[PDB]
Design a protein around this ligand. Structure first.
Ligand SMILES: *C(#N)[C]([C]O[C]C1=[C][C]=[C][C]=[C]1)[N]C(=O)[C]([C][C]([C])[C])[N]C(=O)N1[C][C]O[C][C]1
Length: 217
């Protein structure tokens, strides 16, 4: 496997989004992963509708819109629904709404998704290198995460109890300090212009490899 990977260099990552006061991190993580597969399949980079997931991948998928959800069940909704609309056609409003999905605005489909084995950072590395960005849950419930500005994030009090959905779009090292390159959905003012480099091969730091999954088309 390559020592470092950055899917942004491969044109498979869209602009960083701002979820606002709506807890739709799970929806942003899911569309983010599917956006890369869509680019790999069609050659086009298009932001997909996180709102579509918030409003439609609801109770039947164990999700609660702005109150939380799962990337895996979000992928299953897209599969069952036979599509997800473009973000342009179904914009994000940072609030729960009645489902407004319309197949006339479909921008992607999904045929399946894969959940990686719990806590295996080596397996996660292989997936990021060979398949594409991977949706993951992390424990972001610590002040240091909110205050992160730059460098490799390491929090001694981090746990494997995850609560925030994000997207691993690469991996590498900062002068030896290995990290996972993570796209967040807290806007471009968060961390490294929307990204955070989280400690890699540090005993499943913040549970980054606890629940990884990626979709395919
Ligand atoms: C996102 N956004 C939400 C809310 O995140 C809370 C938070 C905020 C700041 C720092 C740390 C955490 N999270 C979720 O949607 C998570 C994602 C999952 C992969 C861990 N899911 C969630 O909270 N659920 C609770 C309700 O049932 C569905 C899942």
């Amino acid at each position: 496997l390559p020592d470092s990977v950055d899917w942004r260099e491969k044109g498979c990552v869209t602009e960083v989004k701002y979820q606002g006061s709506c807890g739709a991190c799970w929806a942003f993580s899911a569309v983010g992963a599917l956006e890369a597969q869509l680019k790999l399949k069609t050659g086009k980079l298009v932001s997909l509708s996180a709102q579509n997931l918030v409003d439609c991948s609801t109770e039947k998928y164990g999700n609660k819109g702005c109150n939380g959800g799962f990337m895996t069940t979000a992928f299953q909704y897209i599969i069952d629904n036979k599509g997800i609309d473009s973000d342009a056609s179904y914009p994000y409003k940072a609030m729960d709404q009645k489902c407004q999905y319309d197949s006339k605005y479909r921008a992607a489909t999904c045929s399946k998704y894969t959940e990686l084995p719990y806590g295996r950072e080596d397996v996660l590395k292989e997936a990021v290198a060979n398949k594409g960005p991977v949706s993951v849950g992390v424990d972001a419930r610590h002040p240091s995460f909110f205050l992160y500005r730059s460098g490799v994030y390491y929090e001694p009090s981090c746990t494997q109890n995850v609560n925030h959905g994000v997207l691993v779009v690469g991996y590498g090292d900062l002068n030896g300090k290995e990290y996972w390159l993570v796209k967040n959905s807290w806007g471009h003012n968060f961390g490294e212009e929307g990204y955070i480099r989280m400690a890699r091969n540090k005993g499943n730091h913040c549970g980054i490899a606890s629940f990884p999954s990626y979709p395919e088309i």
